[PDB]
Amino acid sequence: GAMGATPEEYYKATGKKITEYHESPMLTKLVEEGKLPPVEQRLPEEPLVVQPVEKVGQFGGTWRRVWKGPSDRWGISKLIEVKLAFWDKEGGKLVPGLAKSWEVLENGRVYIFHLRKGVKWSDGAPYTAHDIVFWVNDIVGNDDITPSKPDWYNIGVKVEALDDYTVKFEFSKPYGLFLLKVPYGGFTGAPAHYLKQFHPKYTPMEEIEKKMVEGVHNTWVDLFNDKNDFLENTELPTLSPWKPITDPTEQFYILERNPYFWAVDIEGNQLPYIDYVRHEYVKNDEVILLKAISGEIDMQWRHIGGLGAGAGNFTLLMENSQSGGYRVLKWIAANGSASRISLNYAHSDEVLRKVFNDVRFRQALSLAINREEINEILFNGLAEPRQASLVSGSPYFDPEWEKAYAEYDPDRANKLLDEMGLKWDDKHEYRLLPDGRPLRFTITVTGQFHVDVWTMVKEYWKQIGVWVEIENLERSLFYERADAGDFDAMVWNMDRAAQPLSSPMVIFPGSENIADFWYIGWSGWISYYIDKNIRGVEPEEVPEGPEPPEVVYRLVDLYYQIASTPDPDKIKELMAEATKIHRENLWMIGTVGEDLSPAIAKNNFRNVPEFLVTDDVLRTPLNAMPMQFFIEQ
């Protein structure tokens, strides 16, 4: 729902005081038996304050799910994860987490995070900024434990605890993108008080070897990673709302509430609401669907939401909601299109290149597409005729660009080609290029699904006299053709269209070390440009081939601005320009978008959002904030 950084801050915003703290009965029993300190002591001085999605919840219950065993690690992680600052629900802005407030200084060179005094790990030990430092220096920054470094660490970084409750990240140079890393990654750190006994920097190697077990831990790194394993190690102190109390190989993998969890309700209830969450090991997708349909799953999206793409599974989930005692949540995937196309704008054939770089040709090509129709037959009819951009419910969403030339207007396209001078042939069957060649090209795809999509577009484009055929190539040949520039047109999906900036290659040329298909031929010049202007220490050698439009060089400039600026006001304004550019030029021509990625929740399972966009970058379902889910009592 929403986050008050602090009870005081919640009060300042809302006029309501949290005057009293409450706890789950099972925890009250423990403190009465003398085995736990009381909630007032367990909580920090200033807990995170969480506003329910739906209503103030009730304590108790066991949340039944299903998983595919230890292999299915990240499904548990995405229930259990905690951040210094979380994504909001949509995915554009930071929201208080384990940090009550943060600070961006020296133009995105340094970041200060202010922690919450009195936060304790799940075993009772104090959580401090030293646990973060321990994590960045001695785990992430340790070559044995972590041989391959993360993006943000390869940019030079110095991390220090200014005091117990203040941590400072100082980068070499500015680095505005870091704010987008924090809601994704594990910057909350790790429990040094527990882990240092397994670390050679802090413990004599002889003492470490005495705790290794033969036939399992061959090196000390193996022991460390086993101990720092959130899934396997029941003894690992945690900041998560639940902790494992059974082995994941057992048929029931059980998480129990963390009695030191550091967030509360608007009414002062210490979260989570739910006491236990249990996953049953299951053998296959089909056991998952039968248990879902039978109302044996209290709430789940993970495997439900890939099956719900297929028409046979979605119908069945819907048909069974009533008997099953659950509802189907119409969450969407974060793809701007399930199947888009880009033409080869560096085409070797100079005649086709010219036709292809004419905006009007692309405008025409999209207008000839009956998206609504494609929806009905292939998608059944799910989900949304559009082209072909950032999906609805995303920070930088573009409503204009969603509509582009999205209409099914053949007469308008046909006309737009006539404007170009592409004259119809004598049999008025297809039209012709300036050299009298039949206007024809091949659409290159990989996968039977995409064949079907564009096989239908074969017809729609025939109505404007544009001749196409469809070649379906094996994955690796498809990619080798692409890197060689040996194609007329390439189709691909367009996922990661909610928060592009974690995977910016599709919107921004030269934002990553690999290019998207639509500008791949321009990679020579794009690399030459960035090297010259932005660095700006240039290369002495100029590359051959067609140079890109000036509007492409602009998209680069936008990205490198976005990369350097921290305040998300400026980002949203800068992304506006990018999406404007992509609007005026239609380098990607998609059909539809926003596949349904459904979840289910029992009728008595509450505080689950009706609508949601799902993506790995948003850590779905963390995006729904499961710490405040509850079961009616």
Give the chain's end-to-end CA distance (angstroms, integer).
Answer: 21
Phi-psi region of 118 (alpha: psi -120 to 50; beta: other; left: phi over 0): left
CA dist 494 and 343 (Å) reads 15
CA 35 to each of CA 30, 31, 38, 237, 563: distance values in angstroms, whole numbers, following the listed order: 5, 6, 10, 17, 50
CA dist 415 and 629 (Å) reads 55
Per the structure block, which two tokens stand in for 453? Answer: 């999509």
Residues 6+ apart with CB under 8 A from 545: 346, 521, 522, 524, 525
To one decimal, the resolution in angstroms is 2.6
CA dist 591 and 457 (Å) reads 10
CA dist 242 and 257 (Å) reads 4
Q: Which residues is 613 bridged to in the sheet? A: 332
Chain-centre distance for alpha carbon 242: 22
Contact (Cβ atoms closer than 8 angstroms) between residue 529 and residue 553: yes
For 63-92, b/e burial (b = at least 16 CB within 10 A) is: bbbbbbeeebbebbebbbbbbbbbbbbbbb
Helix ranges restricted to H, 375-424: 399-403, 410-420
CA dist 371 and 457 (Å) reads 9
Other Cβ atoms within 10 Å of 163 Cβ, number: 11
Other Cβ atoms within 10 Å of 57 Cβ, number: 24
Residues 6+ apart with CB under 8 A from 555: 507, 508, 509, 578, 581, 582
Residue with tokens 């009772």: 124
CA dist 405 and 363 (Å) reads 6
DSSP, residue by residue, 363-383: HHHHHT--HHHHIIIIISS-S
Instruction: Please report which helix (H) or strand (E) contains residue 109, including its range.
Output: none
DSSP code of 149?
A: P
CA dist 571 and 173 (Å) reads 19
Q: Is 402 exposed, middle or buried (0-12, 13-18, 19+ CB in 10 A)?
A: buried
Ramachandran angles phi, psi of 225, nearest 5°: -65, -30
CA dist 412 and 591 (Å) reads 18
CA 197 to each of CA 218, 233, 455, 615: distance values in angstroms, whole numbers, following the listed order: 17, 15, 62, 37
CA dist 109 and 120 (Å) reads 30
CA dist 299 and 505 (Å) reads 34
In single-letter form, the type of residue at position 173 comes to: K
CA dist 202 and 355 (Å) reads 66
Per the structure block, which two tokens stand in for 83? Answer: 């951040």
Residues 6+ apart with CB under 8 A from 172: 109, 155, 156, 157
In single-letter form, the type of residue at position 360 comes to: R
Domains in the chain: boundaries? 1-82+230-283+621-633, 83-229, 284-336+594-620, 337-593
CA 588 to each of CA 220, 340, 369, 459: distance values in angstroms, whole numbers, following the listed order: 50, 6, 13, 20
Please provide the size of the chain in residues: 633
With H, G, I as helix, E, B as strand and everything else as coil, classify residue 515: coil
Per the structure block, which two tokens stand in for 78? Answer: 């995405």
Largest CA-CA distance found in the chain, in angstroms, rounded:
94
Sign of the dihedral through C-alpha 313, 314, 315, 320: positive
- Nearest CA among 555, 544, 549 for reference residue 485: 544
CA 34 to each of CA 28, 37, 38, 126: distance values in angstroms, whole numbers, following the listed order: 10, 7, 9, 20
DSSP, residue by residue, 302-365: TTHHHHTTSHHHHHHHHHHHHHHTEEEE--EE--SEEEEEEE-TT-SSHHHHHHHH-HHHHHHH
